[PDB]
């Protein structure tokens, strides 16, 4: 699964019709987040889900925050955001309601967010998830 996801990162710049900060995640990686088995049960994460996210944590690690956009500025939708947090979709809308998670362009007053349109950056959606500590994080070892 790592080597399958490694070629998509190396050949990310090849596929670009627009800039990284304007392109969606499913345009480069393709369905690999919303196909993943859900963690609605117990808050017990799937071994497929543990392996996917732990690759994305080292992606933003290798792609620091510079003035040129890179692979860590790909746009993520509210459903793909809901899976990466492992919570309900209303709970992730409520974080948007109290401006905890910051969209990536301003909707103009009658814009209610399309649930499939890529709203948030991959970047700080991960950093929000690393603000919550669970036992098998890479920080301790």
């Amino acid at each position: 699964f790592n080597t399958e996801l490694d070629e998509l990162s190396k050949n990310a710049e090849m596929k670009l019709i627009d800039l990284f900060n304007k392109t969606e995640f499913k345009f480069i990686f393709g369905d690999a987040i919303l196909a993943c088995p859900s963690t609605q049960k117990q808050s017990e994460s799937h071994f497929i889900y543990r392996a996917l996210l732990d690759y994305l944590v080292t992606l933003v690690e290798s792609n620091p925050k510079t003035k040129k956009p890179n692979a860590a500025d790909l746009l993520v939708s509210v459903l793909e955001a809901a899976t990466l947090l492992g919570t309900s979709v209303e709970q992730v809308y409520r974080l948007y309601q109290n401006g905890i998670l910051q969209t990536a362009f301003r909707h103009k007053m009658n814009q209610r967010i399309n649930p499939y349109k890529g709203a948030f950056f991959l970047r700080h959606v991960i950093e929000y998830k690393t603000s919550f500590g669970n036992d098998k994080a890479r920080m301790y070892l």
């Binding site: 808050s43 925050k65 700080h124 950093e127 929000y128 603000s131 919550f132 669970n134 036992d135 920080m139």
Partner: protein, 117 residues
């Protein structure tokens, strides 16, 4: 500046940072804080905005609205002070979604504690 003191198994974040400024160097924690505020401001404005000057509100659970930016600031702090990666992030008292019967909780290595305690 390159602090040579390294974190213990159960040392607090504040303890380790005060032991960083215990090296003479900087006179007080404030002097170090303002010097890193300057270097973050020149690097990343969002992480600069997140990183507080006081030692009061430096733990991750204090930041309700800028946690993601706080982690960023902490990671840049590691990168900037000649420390290994995660060095400050293992001493952090992280956030937790688990409620102790309508009581918000706090996360240490493996263990989640009620915020009342």
């Amino acid at each position: 500046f390159s602090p040579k003191a390294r974190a213990f198994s159960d040392e607090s974040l504040e303890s380790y940072l005060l032991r960083v400024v215990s090296e003479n160097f900087f006179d007080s924690y404030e002097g170090l804080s303002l010097a890193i505020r300057e270097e973050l401001h020149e690097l990343d404005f969002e992480a600069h905005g997140a990183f507080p000057v006081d030692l009061k509100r430096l733990n991750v659970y204090h930041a309700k609205h800028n946690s993601h930016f706080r982690m960023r600031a902490l990671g840049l702090l590691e990168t900037l002070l000649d420390l290994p990666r995660y060095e400050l992030q293992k001493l952090a008292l992280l956030k937790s979604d688990i409620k102790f019967n309508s009581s918000v909780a706090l996360y240490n290595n493996g263990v989640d504690i009620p915020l009342r305690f």
